[PDB]
Each structure stands twice: as C-alpha cells, then as structure tokens.
Design a protein around this ligand. Structure first.
Ligand SMILES: NC[C@@]1(C(=O)Nc2cncc3ccccc23)CCOc2ccc(Cl)cc21
Ligand SMILES: NC[C@@]1(C(=O)Nc2cncc3ccccc23)CCOc2ccc(Cl)cc21
Lengths: 304, 304
C-alpha cells in the first residue's frame, strides 16, 4: 500500500551520461554505443541563441572542437552530424555500459522519468509527463541541457526526451532522441508561449483507481455518467476529452476495483463540480494527472 | 526553474540489491562488501509473524538455509548473525559494485530516497521523509521488505532505512542499517498504531522559499511574527514547533531570497489560518513538508 510519484531506477541511464563542451558551452550528452547525443545548441554562445543559424555555426566546428568527457576520461571524437536539433558525435569507443535501448517519440499524457544532470553528472531523478501543450514541468537549472527522459521495460531503456529549453514561464521544452521538438518549440531565445495546459483526464481516472486500491474511497459516489455527459463537464474544466480508447485502457483498473469506468467518471465529475472540500486523495489536495493507467498497474503490481 | 520531488540517482544502490530467501519467504537484501543485510523476519512463516521468538526461530537456521541471489548467480553464505531486527549474512564474495558508504540513523523531518525492490530487483525510486511519528509514507507491496532508504553526498551513500513493515493504516515502519526500528515499532504482526502525523514546519518553510525562488510569490504577505507567536499557531495546526536551530538552518534560503525567516513564518501563519483559497504553490494545493532546507538548496543549486 501507499502511492508515490515513482521514477524508474536510473542506474542504466547514469552509465550513459557524459559531459559535452564546445568552446565555452558545456552541457550533457547521452553516450549509446559509439555515439554521443546532445542538444545542437552546444555550438552556440549566449549571443548566438538569439538568432542561430545552426548549419552555419556548425561549419566552424570540427571533430576536435567537441570535448566529450565520461567520468574523468576524455573520449575521442571521430565524427559529427546534426540530426534535426541534436548533434550525434561519433566517438572511437562504444559505451561499455550501453543498456538495451530504443528511441521512442511519446504522445501527450505519457509519463517518463528524467535524470537531471550537470556537467555529465546525475544530480537527481523525478517523474513527469508530456503535457497536452507539449511542454514538461521539470526541474532544470542552467547546465541541465542534455538531461534525458526515459521509460524502462525490464532491461530495455526507451529514451523519449532530451532537455533543451526553458520557456520564460518556467516550463520546459525538448526533443525526442531524433532531435525533433515535442510541440512547436524551436531552439532559439525567442518569445515562445505555451498553449493551454489541459489536465490528462485518463491519468486522473487512473489515479482515482490507485486511490480506491489504496483505501481512499470517500469520493466514490452513487452516480454514473456517459462519455458525452462527462466530456461536457471535462471541457468546462480544461480536461482533455475522454475517448473509448481511454475507457479500454482503464479496463484492467476497472476490473481490479469492480468500479465501472463511467462510474469513476461520474465521481470525477462531482469532484470537479464540488471541489475537494478541504479533503485529500492519496495525500494530494488536487487531482493528479501524471500517473498513466500503466503506471498505476505497475506500481500496484510490482513490475521490476 | 521548476521544483520536483526529486530522488537521488539510484544506480549506486541498484548495484547492491540482492534477493534473500529463507525457506519459503523471499525478500530483498543489501550487499555491501562481503555482508548481506536483510530484515530478520526472512526466517518467519506468515504464522510465525503473529508471535515470533526470533532467537529461537534462528536456532533452526544454518548458513545454507539462506539463499542469496545477485542478479542470476548464487552467493555462498559462510556466516550469519542477528543484529537487532536485521540479519547480516556473511558471503564469500565482496560486492564488486560496493559504493563508498555509511550507516546513518536519521532524525524525524529528514528526507531520503527509497529504491523499492521485489525479488532483489529494483522497480522504482521515490523520495520520502521520516515522519515525526517515525513512520514513512512509502509505496511498498508484499515482497518489498529489505528495500532501503538512502541519501548520497557526491559518491558516498548514507543508508538510513530498511523497509520491514506496513501498519494496518497503510503507513510504513522500518529500521536503520543496525536493525533498530525508527520509533516504537516491533517486527510482529500485532496491533501497532501510529502517533500524530505532525507537519515538518522547517520543511514547509524551506519549500515556501523554493516557491519564491521559482516565481510563486502570491502568498508573501506584509506581516512578520515571532517564534513564540508562530508556534502558538503551529501547535493549533499540528505543525512541529519551530526552534532557533530551524531558523539557523533556513539562513541560506533567507539570504538567497532576501525574505527574513520570521517574515516567511508570518506568511505560513496566514496560509494556515486562511487556507489556499483554491490557489496552488509549486503545483500543490497543500503545504509540502518532504523537502528539507538542504534539499531546496541542492535542487536550486545543482549539487551532483
Ligand atoms: N542554455 C540554453 C538555453 C536554455 O533554454 N536554458 C535553460 C534550460 N533549462 C533550464 C534552465 C534554467 C536556468 C537557466 C537556463 C536554463 C538558454 C536560454 O535560451 C535558450 C533558448 C533556446 C534553447 Cl534550445 C536553449 C536556451
Ligand atoms: N511481509 C512481512 C509483513 C509486512 O509488514 N508486510 C508488508 C510490508 N510492506 C508492504 C506490504 C504490502 C502488502 C502486504 C504486505 C506488506 C507481513 C505482515 O506482518 C508483518 C508484521 C511485522 C513485520 Cl516486521 C512484517 C510483516
């Protein structure tokens, strides 16, 4: 029992973190096999960030201008290429700690763990979600660029995020491991405002199932609703629309608790309309949406 | 910017996790040097837990009855001893992944990361605090016993907790690495109720400083208070008394923000008396108390 915002164990990713320096800019890189991935803005000065032409800036860089350091040993750069907003630095040594891996591009609502790093050294690990506006609410300081987001399936690390940018509003923007930004963000120090941060409805429902499983049942009411009726209320509260696919995904949690998904929807509808009235659910005074249905099942079953 | 419930990177502790089986009971162990630490209740059957005489139960166990498995290889047990509520199993192989370590007994209010494990395999990592009633609000399922709590200082892991028990109320009880329980709990399946879960005042204040640093300033008011006046209100809200030592510990955060500690206390007093009024602080609708002043400085400075 108990339910916590749990991140995957980070060891497999810690063994991949390197420091990349280009000139006077230092950030983090991910060393998988004989390639080091990092944000392409490692080639920029603070003045370059205002209006960078990466292709032109990159012409002035050779293999030897990219200093890659693993722990306290220097890696030899034998190649470099820009792919979208990431640089891939070919090194002469395959990472001996390379775990089994995949590069995945996640959808909004999906959760992942972040291993925040500074100077190629891991400082902490936390869980977050890809917001419906394609930002992430992370914890990143200057030097954290190149920190990655990932999920683990037994022994395979699926890398889904690389940190690049912090918007003026304190939210974060980054890419998948192919260098494509999530959302409309661009790696430039220009005014970029985030869209509406809607609540991930399917995740809130999953977390209400986790609460029932852990004994917090006060919010269960005598009502039911329909997808159309629930969504009318969800729209009004800036909640993402719930679809039959989301209902299907909540099937296993519905079976575990014996509470039909549309009954849980009616409970959520009353929670939105009436508020919490000073009460808490799983130690929270707000409805949590950064636990997917898969995270609830994994945490409540013990997948290792 | 951004502030998350961040755990330490777990790799150094993942390399220590082993599975310990005694008869038909299987739990987790911590392998440091040539010793494996685990809850002494590994020798109990479910019926034994009701009224176990550990010294007597242990007489019926020899070195070969303790099966220690690291990854998928069996370790040879050449000795065993009970120290308080933990068993120390001497094995013939020193853990090659043993990090630099210490065994520390933490005080209530102190935070640590937990690497939840099942069958010696890490499933997740989260941050929690030693509650003032000596329980921890963790996330532990059956088989999670032997999972450890720790803090890291650069490359030294300070192990402070080993998970043993779940109270009927869903809160958790465990020991330091010398086998002494935190609080009055005993490793027996008997009625043990927790005391008052007071709020860690110094941690709430630290988190209010983290909020100011991250831009959430709405709750800053025009008032100040005294330690005596603040504590009168803190007692009424089941908040731990604030002392001059806590004020001293908040000194660095007070300097960073320019907000005197007693002014932050007055802000907290108004928050307790008036509530949040539907507003949030660092994405929370309640006052968070599982971030120490040291965790705030570390997260807001980037200690690796
Ligand atoms: N360092 C690159 C930089 C950045 O986002 N900084 C940061 C990113 N994340 C946390 C930060 C906390 C504090 C200070 C800066 C942070 C600088 C600002 O302009 C930009 C603009 C675009 C891009 Cl792709 C990167 C950047
Ligand atoms: N397995 C030992 C056991 C335990 O606490 N179980 C658990 C501990 N933590 C999470 C659990 C989630 C679900 C199921 C059991 C859990 C069993 C119950 O009686 C006791 C009594 C004392 C002690 Cl020192 C241990 C125990």
């Amino acid at each position: 029992s108990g339910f916590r915002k749990m991140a995957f164990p980070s060891g497999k990713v810690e063994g991949c973190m390197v420091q990349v320096t280009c000139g006077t800019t230092t950030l983090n890189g991910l060393w998988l096999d004989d390639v080091v991935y990092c944000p392409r803005h490692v080639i920029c000065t603070s003045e370059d960030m205002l209006n960078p032409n990466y292709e032109d800036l990159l012409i002035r860089k050779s293999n030897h201008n990219f200093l890659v350091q693993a722990g306290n040993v220097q890696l030899r750069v034998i190649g470099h290429s820009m792919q979208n907003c990431v640089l891939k630095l070919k090194v002469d040594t395959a990472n001996p700690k390379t775990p089994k891996y995949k590069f995945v591009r996640i959808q909004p609502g999906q959760t992942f763990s972040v291993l925040a790093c500074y100077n190629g050294s891991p400082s902490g690990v936390y869980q977050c979600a890809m917001r419906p506006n394609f930002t992430i609410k992370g914890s990143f300081l200057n030097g954290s660029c190149g920190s990655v987001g990932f999920n683990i399936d037994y022994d395979c690390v699926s890398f889904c995020y690389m940190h690049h940018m912090e918007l003026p509003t304190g939210v974060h923007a980054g890419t998948d491991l192919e260098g494509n930004f999530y959302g409309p963000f661009v790696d430039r120090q220009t005014a970029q405002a985030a869209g509406t941060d809607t609540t991930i409805t399917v995740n809130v429902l999953a977390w209400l199932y986790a609460a029932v499983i852990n004994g917090d049942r006060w919010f269960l009411n005598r009502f039911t609703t329909t997808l159309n009726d629930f969504n009318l209320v969800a729209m009004k509260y800036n909640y993402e629309p719930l679809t039959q696919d989301h209902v299907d995904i909540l099937g296993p949690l519905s079976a575990q608790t014996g509470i039909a998904v549309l009954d849980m929807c009616a409970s959520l509808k009353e929670l939105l309309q009436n508020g919490m009235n000073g009460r808490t659910i799983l130690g929270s005074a707000l409805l949590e949406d950064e636990f997917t249905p898969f995270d609830v099942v994994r945490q409540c079953s013990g997948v290792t």
